[PDB]
Write a structure and sequence with these properties.
heterotetramer; A: elongated; B: mainly alpha; Retinoid X Receptor; 3 strands; 3% strand; globular; binds ligand HXI; transcription; VDR; tetrameric; Nuclear receptor coactivator 2
């Protein structure tokens, strides 16, 4: 659900 | 005397802030431009959205934040991002102008500019008074970054799992801040308590801002102006 | 001879297009600016996103589109929006430049500008050849808008419920176009068949574009640059 | 699921 946040968290 | 492990934590929090905060504000020319119906929501939604990426970048360099379960990292960030934003904007806040000045009259944001983005004086009245009182504290760079890191490492947020672990992290940063002030900030005898109070006002500012974001995000004509990261981070998904 | 109900349909399709297509392209200064890593995705995502609102505006004024169940309206729009976009961009396409020219060198989009937004020559090779062949047809204004309305009113789209009803709508527009050409377009004896062929190439362009959108939207570093309406319309939710 | 599209469709 946090598709962008996971990406951003490397 | 600060320990050697204490000034390491200060050294890497300052470097983390320097890598994720660009005093030239030159990236700001890439946001949807400011218009001064809510005419500033595109530019301000873009500004917040960009700032959120800087805070994610900053967070990943706090000692041991990366070591947390990826669910805790997200939980810490979804609840604290807007407070770190309010904290870090102090660096462009100007007591002379009563506005955030980011290089050029086109990136100078009065209170009015923010009302033309959806928000009311119910959030902008306390937010500006928080900004000036934080500006008056005249924090060292090391204190500013410590406070942002203590804010992000708060155990008492909705959805955090390792309450034990990150309370210990935040404990280790508070002790650095207490020692730094006493040892390096002359006349700082009451500074730690004032800083702690600033964290409390942030929770009150967060609450008001989340209220006003809800009402924006419930009207599609406005929420379509937000960005995908704003909607994912300020959004209420669990 | 066109009937009276036939030229009414032409009169309101032309007016609908004129209200939703601004030849000054002056709104374009509000998109995230063009940068020429994919440097044009912010500006182009903004351009498409804006165009989608114009197509929704245009669609709501097609005779009897508003009369459809709100699920059919959405179904028609999710599948056909990108084709109407490709169709309507013909109005700024320039055979002299081989680019869409929207007033000023900063809103002049070569093929290269579009590759710097994620897309490949596998979509841009057929898309430009579609643009010039459609440009060569030298359509009257009445034919352009009829073709966009026939495209939007296609029954053979995934998710449409009233197949009967909107096939009858699209039938009524095809007969207007056939009559208009024969009666008002001198030398138009083969024009209707060429136009019908253009619809077919659109399905091939749509398919390639949807392929390439998928791969963008599966990489969060790129999909975070899209807008909320792009993600909702080109997205695969049912 | 089409929160914006419904809004836009008046
Ligand atoms: C943010 C920073 C700076 C300034 C901060 C400003 C001007 C500011 C002014 C008032 C309020 C806030 C808080 C975030 C909000 C919101 C908008 C919104 O609620 C909505 F748009 F919906 F209205 C959303 F975007 F959050 F969704 C920031 C400049 C520089 O110091 C970098 C720093 O990072
Ligand atoms: C659109 C118009 C105009 C020009 C059209 C252009 C330049 C154009 C060029 C190549 C391809 C397309 C099709 C849409 C796409 C996409 C991007 C994307 O795939 C992604 F961004 F992801 F890359 C997405 F945005 F759709 F998501 C449009 C100007 C004027 O004639 C108004 C007209 O309406």
């Amino acid at each position: 659900k946090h598709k962008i946040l996971h990406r951003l968290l490397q | 005397m600060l320990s050697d492990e204490q000034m390491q934590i200060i050294n890497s929090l300052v470097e983390a802030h320097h890598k994720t905060y660009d005093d030239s504000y030159s990236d700001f020319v890439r946001f949807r431009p400011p218009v001064r119906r809510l005419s500033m929501l595109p530019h301000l939604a873009d500004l917040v959205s960009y700032s959120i990426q800087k805070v994610i970048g900053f967070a990943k360099m706090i000692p041991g934040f990366r070591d947390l379960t990826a669910e805790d990292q997200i939980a810490l960030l979804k609840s604290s991002a807007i407070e770190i934003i309010m904290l870090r904007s102090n660096q462009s806040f100007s007591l002379e102008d009563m506005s955030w000045s980011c290089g050029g009259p086109d990136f100078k944001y009065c209170i009015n500019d923010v009302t033309k983005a959806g928000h009311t004086l119910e959030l902008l009245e306390p937010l500006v008074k928080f900004q000036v009182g934080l500006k008056k504290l005249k924090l060292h760079e090391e204190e500013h970054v410590l406070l942002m890191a203590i804010c992000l490492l708060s155990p008492d947020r909705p959805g955090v799992q390792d309450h034990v672990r990150i309370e210990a992290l935040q404990d280790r940063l508070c002790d650095v801040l207490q020692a730094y002030i006493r040892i390096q900030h002359p006349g700082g005898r009451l500074l730690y308590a004032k800083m702690i109070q600033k964290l409390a006002d942030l929770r009150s500012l967060n609450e008001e801002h989340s209220k006003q974001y809800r009402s924006l995000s419930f009207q599609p004509e406005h929420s379509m102006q937000l960005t995908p990261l704003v909607l994912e981070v300020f959004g209420s998904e669990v």
